[PDB]
């Protein structure tokens, strides 16, 4: 017996997503393509964030992705930043930003 994830060619657990859609009371029924589609959309977004967080980890001479790296990856990306606009990432800090009028007159 081969798993549903393996068939759809995914890492995320298609069977779990299906089970979760059902026990969530989203609808009376849940077509079979739905947990596949959704599982892949979740994997992708995970890949997009881990890809950028990873770069951030590189740019900081580090190999281990920490909350800081996830915050920099999200706030420096226009789309991810919007999608997570009302979200607070614990121990993320903020982007280095100083209003120009506050800088020395030179």
């Amino acid at each position: 017996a081969k798993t549903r994830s393996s068939r759809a060619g995914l890492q995320f657990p298609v069977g779990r997503v299906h089970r979760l859609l059902r026990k969530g009371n989203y609808a009376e029924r849940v077509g079979a393509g739905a947990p596949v589609y959704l599982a892949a959309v979740l994997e992708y977004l995970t890949a997009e964030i881990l890809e950028l967080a990873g770069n951030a980890a590189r740019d900081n001479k580090k190999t281990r992705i920490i909350p800081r790296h996830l915050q920099l990856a999200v706030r420096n990306d226009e789309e991810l930043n919007k999608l997570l606009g009302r979200v607070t990432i614990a121990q993320g800090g903020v982007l280095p930003n100083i209003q120009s009028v506050l800088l020395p007159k030179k």
């Binding site: 800081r68 614990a90 121990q91 800090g93 903020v94 982007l95 280095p96 930003n97 020395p104």
Partner: protein
């Protein structure tokens, strides 16, 4: 007798705290504040340590972002010194006020 000009160290601080993520309010003092407030809704409550830490991370991130908005309102007023009215104006526009 060395002495840095007003603003140089403050600016130096902005750069320092914007690079780090550690919480900025002392923990025990915060925990006390939290327990006191809750005591008003229900007596003899216990708090998971992770619960308190969740409140703190949420509160600081909230205050920090509010200072960003406040700072923009002071700058709007052609000032560099944030004042209560800057905070009020920011909260009023966010809909947290009027």
């Amino acid at each position: 007798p060395h002495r840095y000009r007003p603003g140089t160290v403050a600016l130096r601080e902005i750069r320092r705290y914007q690079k780090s993520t550690e919480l900025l309010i002392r923990k025990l003092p915060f925990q006390r504040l939290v327990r006191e407030i809750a005591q008003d809704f229900k007596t003899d409550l216990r708090f998971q340590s992770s619960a308190v830490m969740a409140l703190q991370e949420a509160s600081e991130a909230y205050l920090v972002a509010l200072f960003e908005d406040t700072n923009l309102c002071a700058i709007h007023a052609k000032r560099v010194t944030i004042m209560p009215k800057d905070i009020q104006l920011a909260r009023r526009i966010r809909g947290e006020r009027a």
